[PDB]
Design a protein around this ligand. Structure first.
Ligand SMILES: [Ca+2]
Ligand SMILES: [Ca+2]
Length: 322
């Protein structure tokens, strides 16, 4: 049904490997310096020094494709500036049908393992099935790029690998917090908002985008590279893409307050202002609202008020489907 990237046929390649008692080695994306990168991850780079390509089945006795669902907690940025892509993947997990397109859930390391996995990527303006072998860059016994908070989980590492594959290298995934040089992730129309000059009904726009399963991301702009990925006083990261993962209205001190939830794809480092995990704003909402929305954990995810949100962040991007 879906076009096969480069004519590679997952099931056909899988059984060939099974029947010959072997593990898949992708010719289309070899475990080689050029697959890593071309400059910062380039030949002989100190960043790539000591990298080896190892299967999860070499690292562990119990590797898992999916552990407790394929969720946003499974997206932790490694040593690669692919924050926009990782933020989009985190947002994609919130969309159940789209997630089950992109990440075929049947796959595992247990039954019929041949060192091969596949994903359905939006490429050339259609759904494209992409195979990968499960060799992944490792440094000091750990994944170099995206990892899950669950150490034996590999769907996201493998998904990032498929993206690296269709772009020719991992470094090719790097860049800015915007869709700079990144083709359609979604195919539908992309909406862009400068937050200081937003439509008066922006909160409702965000809310309805989330409800219909669009992907939302936001970032703070920069001019020079000396303040690139610079950390704010209240611990926001500049020039870095965040997933917008939720929006809720609360009754705060008797008044309707609009709140917005976002996730740093680092899976750590969070806003410390009003509505943060440990902030006192939660003492002034209905205790049951509090219990329902607040989660006290260093997980990259946090709430802000929508007003503080539009003050702090420069832009919101919405990626719609077809
Ligand atoms: Ca998981
Ligand atoms: Ca948190």
């Amino acid at each position: 049904n879906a076009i096969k990237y480069l004519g590679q046929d997952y099931e056909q390649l899988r059984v060939r490997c099974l029947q010959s008692g072997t593990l898949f080695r992708d010719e289309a994306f070899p475990p080689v310096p050029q697959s890593l990168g071309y400059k910062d991850l380039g030949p002989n780079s100190s960043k790539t020094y000591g990298i080896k390509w190892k299967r999860p089945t070499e690292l562990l006795s119990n590797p898992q494709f999916i552990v407790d669902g394929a969720t946003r907690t499974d997206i932790c940025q490694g040593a690669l500036g692919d924050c926009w892509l990782l933020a989009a993947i985190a947002s994609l997990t919130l969309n159940d049908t789209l997630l089950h397109r992109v990440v075929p859930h049947g796959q595992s390391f247990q039954n019929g393992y041949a060192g091969i996995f596949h994903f359905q990527l939006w490429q050339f303006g259609e759904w494209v099935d992409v195979v990968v072998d499960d060799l992944l860059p490792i440094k000091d016994g750990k994944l170099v790029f995206v990892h899950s908070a669950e150490g034996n989980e590999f769907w996201s590492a493998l998904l990032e690998k498929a993206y690296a594959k269709v772009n020719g290298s991992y470094e090719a995934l790097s860049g800015g917090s915007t869709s700079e040089g990144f083709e359609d992730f979604t195919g539908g129309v992309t909406e862009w908002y400068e937050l200081r000059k937003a439509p008066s009904d922006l909160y409702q726009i965000i809310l309805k985008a989330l409800e219909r399963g669009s992907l939302l991301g936001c970032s703070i702009d920069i001019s020079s590279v000396l303040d690139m990925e610079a950390i704010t006083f209240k611990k926001l990261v500049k020039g870095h893409a965040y997933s917008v993962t939720g929006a809720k209205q609360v009754n705060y001190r008797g008044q309707v307050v609009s709140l917005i939830r976002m996730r740093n794809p680092w899976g750590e480092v969070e806003w410390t202002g009003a509505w943060s995990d440990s902030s006192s704003e939660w003492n002034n909402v209905d205790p049951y609202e509090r219990d329902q929305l607040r989660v006290k954990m260093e997980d990259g995810e946090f709430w802000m008020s929508f007003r503080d949100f539009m003050r702090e962040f420069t832009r919101l991007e919405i990626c719609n489907l077809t």
